[PDB]
Amino acid sequence: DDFRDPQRWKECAKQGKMPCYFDLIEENVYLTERKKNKSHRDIKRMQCECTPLSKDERAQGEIACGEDCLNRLLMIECSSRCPNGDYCSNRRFQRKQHADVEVILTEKKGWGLRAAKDLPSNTFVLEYCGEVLDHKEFKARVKEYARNKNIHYYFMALKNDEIIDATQKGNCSRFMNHSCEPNCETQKWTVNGQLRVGFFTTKLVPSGSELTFDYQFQRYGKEAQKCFCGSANCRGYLGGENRVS
Amino acid sequence: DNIQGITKPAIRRLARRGGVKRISGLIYEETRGVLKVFLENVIRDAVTYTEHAKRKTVTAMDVVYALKRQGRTLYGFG
Amino acid sequence: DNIQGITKPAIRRLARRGGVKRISGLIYEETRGVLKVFLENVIRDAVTYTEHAKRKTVTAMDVVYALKRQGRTLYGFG
Amino acid sequence: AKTRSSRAGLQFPVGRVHRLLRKGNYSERVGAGAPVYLAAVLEYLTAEILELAGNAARDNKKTRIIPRHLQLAIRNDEELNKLLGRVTIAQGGVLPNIQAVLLP
Amino acid sequence: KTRSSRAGLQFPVGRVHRLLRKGNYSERVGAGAPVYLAAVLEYLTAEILELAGNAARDNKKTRIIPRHLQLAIRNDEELNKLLGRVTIAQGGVLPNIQAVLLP
Amino acid sequence: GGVMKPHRYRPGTVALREIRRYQKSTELLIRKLPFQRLVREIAQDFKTDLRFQSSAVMALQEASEAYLVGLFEDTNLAAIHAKRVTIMPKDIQLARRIRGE
Amino acid sequence: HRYRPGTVALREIRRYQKSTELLIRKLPFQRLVREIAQDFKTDLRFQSSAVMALQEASEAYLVGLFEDTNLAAIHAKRVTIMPKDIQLARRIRGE
Amino acid sequence: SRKESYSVYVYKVLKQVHPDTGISSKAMGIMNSFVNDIFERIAGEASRLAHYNKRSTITSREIQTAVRLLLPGELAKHAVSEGTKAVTKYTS
Amino acid sequence: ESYSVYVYKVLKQVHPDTGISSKAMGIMNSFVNDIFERIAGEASRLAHYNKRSTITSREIQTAVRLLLPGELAKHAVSEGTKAVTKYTS
Amino acid sequence: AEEGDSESEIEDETFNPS
DNA sequence: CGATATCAGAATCCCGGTGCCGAGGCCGCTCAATTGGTCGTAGACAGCTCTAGCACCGCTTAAACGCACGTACGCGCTGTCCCCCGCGTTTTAACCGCCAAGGGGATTACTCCCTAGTCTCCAGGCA
DNA sequence: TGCCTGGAGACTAGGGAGTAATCCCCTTGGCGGTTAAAACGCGGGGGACAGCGCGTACGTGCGTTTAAGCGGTGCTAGAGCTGTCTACGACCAATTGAGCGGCCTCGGCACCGGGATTCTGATATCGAT
């Protein structure tokens, strides 16, 4: 049903039944690339002390860097110099390891994601891929796009000077909806000295169930938006009448 | 009164090297007290060695000797 | 075997001199382990000093020297 | 022939201190003022500990100084206690000390 | 040939002997003493550098910096006992994070 | 609409990260200039108009930080004792009293 | 009649701190020494004062260790000393 | 053979500070141990100071600095005073 | 003077291809000076305690068996014995 | 294929015998 | 029935009588501390050479500061359950006493071989 | 580039280290009695321990503000160390009284003894429910 092909198809600019009317991206792209990074100095040697199994793999071979892996507990992926080489299981973002998920329509609020098969807890779903904005263009993007009539806005505050924007291009995680009783959460993971956001299951998700996370949203614009999920204790309004940033 | 130059995050940093996960807000003054006592004891002896040499510049030897006298041998400056 | 000769009452009396109001029943075997480790460390040195003089008899001075060597300077024997 | 101790006005043996400084191999040469000064300091610390030990003897109503009075001298005074913090005194026992949380 | 060659040592027996005589350790010094002491100091130097070179190679490095000496000395229980009261400049410490601190 | 945030790091995650960061590196932790002023300050009480070798302050800092690290390691053991986690003055004072200072 | 728990403990503390006698029995300690020592040199002879000095040093060591272990148990808000307190006092003492 | 002891000097100082008081031989043995130990500590530091200054002679000043480095607190001031006072009388 | 050149020459036996930094060399130099003083000072005491007048190989050997831990002591004693054996030939 | 910052090595030069 | 108290009775500390052993004074003479003189050199002193240390300046920027705020932690309390304390009886070996063997530490005379001190050759290494 | 200092080669005087013999201090082993301590059992009091719920103070995060390092220019105190030479300490003989050893003597102490106060751990009047 997804049918990711380079030829764009017939849709009324909503990306709902055919994700190829607009343009889509498979990983996070940058606008103002920095030569002032953490990677070459700080993360260079902070690898886990997990002894590499040298002959026990694929059969009676336990996975390298499981929940005993300190880097995993610290929300850091092992670097290219991990002692386990390419057998490390804590290099999921780097390996493009995703979960089986589908994009469907459920409520008048918009499109969403569902798990295609059985998923245990603490299972990595998808990376929040998008355009990384600077201090100057974020405040320009926000004031210029409101008058372009965009229905949804996909700005996420990553750091004091890193803001992800999935508005023009984004992977399949741009569709995960807000839930007050979610089954996934947004975790900050550091990969090779780069900060990245990943979705992880918080409970047992049955085959064919909708995937949602707690949107830790704020309202930056002059306009007011409301949520229609209404599970059991839905707040409904973004941030009250606040004026932050 | 330059003891306040031993800042809260610097003290924290030393505690982190020491493997400390969480720190009480009173620790910063206890640590300033303990460090000032340690340095008082080391500097008084390094100065004693300096005066015995009739020198005025406290040498790295006067310090290594003071630390060795205190029972804490230091390698790298001798 | 003679370490059991360091009786429960004797360990208790040492704890009492040490101001210990209450003692867990597991303290006796640990105190034995710690005492035996301490005495082994002192006797290994006192015997070393004895062997140096090629003497067959360990003197009070060899014990004092082994203790002084370990910083445990003992007064009352030399 | 006034002994060096007499000439220095000390009770301690400046001659013996000079012998030990020379034959203990502390240095190749030993100045004449070194054994005098050292003897005077050993004398001072001997007088200090005997001052406090005699006081402790009176506090225990004993005419003689036993190892306990030396222990109670050395462990009560902050400066002798710091000087001798690593020393064990034979037949000396310890200072009476019960932590506040233990008593009722 | 030097005394070092007769002893089968790299260390300077001449200097050790000179320092034992000149350093007031005794009124005279035996001819076997500086040889035995030189061999001991050389041996501990080799044991230290063996372990520091290993620590460097275990980090895939080719040069021994102070940290490799600290890692080497602290990872062996015997050298750790011998040098337990020694601060090493630029040495740092072993990670050793306590279990009750990990989630 | 508006911006949203990834959730806040779970408490202790940055603490353990800073532990790894500052145990992995070998460098002086205290700001060198403030420390050099502290060292000069307490030296004034012992001898008027003193001067210092640059290497002497480097040595005093290496000694001070090695002392405070050995202190915080034993303090942390005191804080792990009593079934807790947070370092407190009672823990420093205990580590010092047990050590013998 | 019976004294209440710990009353005789506080009484014993006072009796054993006020005295200066050696608390370990002489013969058991002497044999312990002669059995540990036998493993460094065979059939070593001992001056009586050597055994006395070893006992003085061992008792001062254990008494000082107990004084520091007491503060360990007290720090844990306990009153009972336990192996974990000796092992802490030793780890901080450096052993 | 004749053995060295500080007994007569320890006793002379005792009879100066507490004339109507005595001292048991166990206590005398401790006093000997103390005087011998402190002697070796002061002489050891004076030796080390001579070695550091690259001097062959331990002088009254090496002893003075050794005593200052070794003794704590005000006890050091008193000891240095008594040393100077005895060296003054000995100089004349 | 420093033992630096001999430390560097010793390094090439155990690790022919590895280098050592100036600071690390300063550490090895301090370490050799320290253990030298620990053994020589202990040998001095051993001679004085026995009222002897000279530091012999036996005095060094005992100052080592006292100063060094159990297994390291046996190795050091073996290298000292072997060195004096070759030197007396 | 990937390497660390050389500044790490500049702060501590190799022993020079001359 | 409650909150804040009265007497038993085991421990303790006192004032006095006892004897025993070791602190203290004594007496001799070893042996080492003193005196007096001579001598070689350690280091006090005067003087010069310059390398390190101290000082002020300015930019840069990463660090520290101040404050937001959410939720994990340290804490106080409740309960229970278990093991430690206090005590009485039973078990045995630590300690005291006198004793004897003989090992082996301390002592001595004499030997000798080892090291210090000297003087001469020469080779590893500073810019 | 030369050459110089440090290190080794040979011999030397004499005194420290070592053997062989011996004495005889004091340690090891022995036995048996006395009586104190250790062992062994038990009841049940207080404390270790877990669990729970709570209030805040601690970290994690952010935006703002400073001064810590680079790096540089410039002064010059005082570290370093080279020569002079003289007050000093090492050494030795001749000398004598200090103080170690071995000897008594007698009073300071440890101890036994019976009573006075201490303390602890119950039992009981004004209270109140």
Asked if the C-beta of A80 comes within 8 angstroms of chain J's C-beta atoms, the answer is yes
Helix (H) or strand (E) holding D24: none
G25 touches strand K (CB under 7 A): yes
Residue E53 CB-half CA count within 13 A: 18
Say what angle helices G83-93 and F54-80 make with each other, to 10 degrees: 180
- The residue among A232, A215, A145, A223 whose CA lies nearest residue A175 is A215
Specify burial of residue G7 (Cβ count, 10 A radius: 0-12, 13-18, 19+).
Answer: exposed
CB pairs under 8 A between B and H: 21
Residues 19-78 of I with CB under 8 A from C: 45-46, 49-50, 58-59, 62, 65-66
Number of structural domains, chain A? 1
Residue F33 CB-half CA count within 13 A: 0
CA of I77 to C1' of K113 (A): 26
* Phi, psi of D11, deg, nearest 5: -95, -30
- Interchain contact A/H (3 or more Cβ pairs less than 8 Å): no
Find the CATH number of the domain harbouring C69: 1.10.20.10
Per-residue buried b or exposed e for G59-95, using 16+ beta carbons within 10 Å of the residue's own CB: bbbbbbbbbbbbbbbbbbebbebbbbbbbbbbebeee
Both tokens of residue E29? 């010094």
Rounded to whole angstroms, how far apart are CA atoms A43 and A74? 12
With contact defined as beta carbons under 8 Å apart, do G68 and G61 qualify? Answer: no
Residues 1-18 of J with CB under 8 A from I: 12-17
Rounded to whole angstroms, how far apart are CA atoms A53 and D85? 52
- The residue among J16, A200, B23, D3 whose CA lies nearest residue F15 is B23
Cβ within 7 Å of strand L: which of G 18-77? 25, 45-49, 73, 77
**How close does chain D come to G43, measured CA to CA in Å?**
27
Residue G13: how many CB atoms within 10 A of its CB? 24
Q: Could you tell me the maximum CA-CA distance found in chain A, to the nearest angstrom?
A: 61
Specify burial of residue D3 (Cβ count, 10 A radius: 0-12, 13-18, 19+).
Answer: exposed
Chain B hits for E87, Cβ within 8 Å: 67, 72-75
Report the residue count for chain B.
Answer: 78
* Phi, psi of C23, deg, nearest 5: -130, 125
Residue D64 CB-half CA count within 13 A: 8
A91: DSSP letter: -
Both tokens of residue E16? 């050790």
The dihedral over CA atoms of I16, I22, I26, I31, expressed in degrees to the nearest 10, equals -20
Rounded to whole angstroms, how far apart are CA atoms I22 and I26? 6
Per CATH, the number for G7-93 is 1.10.20.10
Rounded to whole angstroms, how far apart are CA atoms D92 and D49? 14
Residue D77: how many CB atoms within 10 A of its CB? 18
Helix (H) or strand (E) holding A229: none
**How close does chain E come to D80, measured CA to CA in Å?**
25
Rounded to whole angstroms, how far apart are CA atoms I39 and I45? 10
For F13-99, which CATH superfamily applies? Histone, subunit A (1.10.20.10)
- The residue among B38, A186, H50 whose CA lies nearest residue E24 is H50
- The residue among A41, A2, A51, A1 whose CA lies nearest residue A172 is A2
Instruction: Tell how strand A124-127 and strand A194-201 pair up.
Output: antiparallel
Rounded to whole angstroms, how far apart are CA atoms E10 and I11? 11
Method by which this entry was solved: cryo-EM
- Interchain contact J/G (3 or more Cβ pairs less than 8 Å): no
Number of structural domains, chain H? 1
Cβ within 7 Å of strand K: which of G 47-86? 80
SS3 E9: coil
Q: Which residues of A are annotated as a binding site for S-adenosyl-L-methionine?
A: 109-111, 152-154, 177-178, 225, 228
Asked if the C-beta of E84 comes within 8 angstroms of chain I's C-beta atoms, the answer is no
* E88, E96, E101: residue with CB nearest B21: E101
Both tokens of residue C64? 């004092």
- The residue among F51, F94, F62, F48 whose CA lies nearest residue F75 is F94
DSSP secondary structure letters along B34-60: HHHHHHHHHHHHHHHHHHHTT-SEEPH
Rounded to whole angstroms, how far apart are CA atoms A141 and I79? 76
Rounded to whole angstroms, how far apart are CA atoms A206 and A230? 21
With contact defined as beta carbons under 8 Å apart, do F15 and A235 qualify? Answer: no
Per-residue buried b or exposed e for D7-42, using 16+ beta carbons within 10 Å of the residue's own CB: ebebbbbbebbbebbbebbbbeebbebbbbbbbbbb
Number of structural domains, chain B? 1
CA of A105 to C1' of L103 (A): 118
Cβ neighbours of residue E102 closer than 8 Å, sequence gap 6 or more: A70, A73, F16
Cβ neighbours of residue I16 closer than 8 Å, sequence gap 6 or more: none
Both tokens of residue A95? 């390996």
Specify burial of residue E61 (Cβ count, 10 A radius: 0-12, 13-18, 19+).
Answer: middle
- Rounded to the nearest angstrom, the gap between the alpha carbon of residue H5 and the centroid of all alpha carbons in its chain is 14
Rounded to whole angstroms, how far apart are CA atoms E36 and I82? 8
Rounded to whole angstroms, how far apart are CA atoms H41 and H47? 10
Q: What is each CA distance from G36 to A213, C6, C48, F66, H78, in whole angstroms?
A: 67, 14, 14, 37, 46
Residue position matching structure tokens 């060795």: B68
Both tokens of residue J8? 């790490």
Domain ranges of chain F: 13-99
Rounded to whole angstroms, how far apart are CA atoms E15 and H76? 38
Radius of gyration of chain H (CA): 16
* Phi, psi of F3, deg, nearest 5: -70, 150
Residue E102: how many CB atoms within 10 A of its CB? 13
Which nucleotide is closest to G82, CA to C1'? L48
Q: What is each CA distance from F100 to A210, G17, H74, in whole angstroms?
A: 63, 20, 21
Residue F49: how many CB atoms within 10 A of its CB? 6
- The residue among B74, E24, E83 whose CA lies nearest residue H51 is E24
| Chain K bases near protein CB atoms (7 A cut-off) | 9-12, 22-24, 30-35, 42-44, 52-54, 62-65, 70-75, 83-87, 93-96, 103-108, 114-116, 124-127
With contact defined as beta carbons under 8 Å apart, do A154 and A130 qualify? Answer: yes
Instruction: Tell how strand A110-115 and strand A210-213 pair up.
Output: antiparallel
Q: Which domains does chain E have, with CATH numbers?
A: 3-101 (1.10.20.10)
Range of the domain at H74: 1-92
Rounded to whole angstroms, how far apart are CA atoms E30 and E44? 22
Both tokens of residue E26? 């005794």
Give chain C as a 3 state SS string.
CCHHHCCHHHHHHHHHHCCCCEECCCHHHHHHHHHHHHHHHHHHHHHHHHHHCCCCEECHHHHHHHHHHCCCCEECCC
With contact defined as beta carbons under 8 Å apart, do A165 and A194 qualify? Answer: no
- Which of G66, G80, G85 to mutate to test binding with chain C, by most C CBs within 10 Å of its CB? G66
Looking at chain G, which residue has its C-alpha nearest residue C30?
Answer: G83
G41 touches strand K (CB under 7 A): no
Find the CATH number of the domain harbouring H54: 1.10.20.10
DSSP secondary structure letters along G36-92: HHTTTSTT-EE-HHHHHHHHHHHHHHHHHHHHHHHHHHHHTT-SEE-HHHHHHHHHH
